[PDB]
Specification:
The protein has 8 helices and 8 strands, in the order βββαβββααββααααα. The chain is an alpha+beta fold. It has 2 domains: 86 residues, Phosphorylase Kinase, domain 1; 174 residues, Transferase(Phosphotransferase), domain 1 (Orthogonal Bundle). The strands form 2 sheets. Strands 1-2-3-5-4 form a 5-stranded antiparallel β-sheet, with no helix packed on it. Strand 1 and strand 2 form a beta hairpin. The structure holds ligand BR2. The PDB classes it as transferase/transferase inhibitor. The entry lists the keywords Kinase, ATP-competitive inhibitor, Ras. The assembly is monomeric.
Length: 260
Amino acid sequence: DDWEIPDGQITVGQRIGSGSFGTVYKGKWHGDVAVKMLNVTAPTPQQLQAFKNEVGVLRKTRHVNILLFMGYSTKPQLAIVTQWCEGSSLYHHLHIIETKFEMIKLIDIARQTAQGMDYLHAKSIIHRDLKSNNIFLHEDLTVKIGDFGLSGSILWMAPEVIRMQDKNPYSFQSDVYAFGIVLYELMTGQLPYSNINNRDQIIFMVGRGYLSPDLSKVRSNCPKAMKRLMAECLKKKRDERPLFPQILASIELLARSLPK
Ligand SMILES: COC1=NN=C2N=CC(NC(=O)c3c(F)ccc(NS(=O)(=O)c4ccccc4)c3F)C=C21
């Protein structure tokens, strides 16, 4: 049962992940794995207990569209080990290497992400940071959402979140908004507000609902039913946003209505 990986079994290697909440290495433990080391310079119980409580959340997930949790380490450092996704993150495809997907593919990526999110929500889990960098595209066909719950993602924040108004702005619908931005990513191929170069103004405007994604860049072959759904997920008033079962429904419908 329990998923604690004993010292020295894992083998950390080439480095990739930077930043806070930890560093990510490609490693080996029963095959290629990813290892994220929280690098919190040795807790500090019960931080050691706050960590275990997050691993409790991960282990509630078992779905092809949710990144596979394989286990966690406490021995050398605190660390979380997942399947190693072969391929690139969605952010990398769209914005770094400018991969051009068939609209059919684009809808399917959208469908899958919605699928995995519906699931996370079904199991009462709020991502709190959906965005293309966290949607890994494995063997270049399957979606793997990872990376759970304030600078690298203001583009995906719903207004209620941006204008840090109360304790918990985070909600299924705050996710649905982030979903709505990655929909804009898929369909426009761009990031939102590319023409405003001052990040503070963005934060200010988006929070007051003066600013919002210019939906008139959805590339021509974007189904109107998609463009409409995109706009529905982006509603400035969070209560007007669909939840994922319905989002999924609309995507599945406009999907089967397409190839002919
Ligand atoms: C270039 O970077 C990469 N190329 N291939 C990769 N394959 C896996 C990668 N894993 C990760 O980035 C990674 C991790 F190592 C531990 C935890 C979480 N998320 S978490 O802790 O939020 C979590 C979410 C869902 C299920 C379990 C844990 C991660 F997202 C990174 C890759």
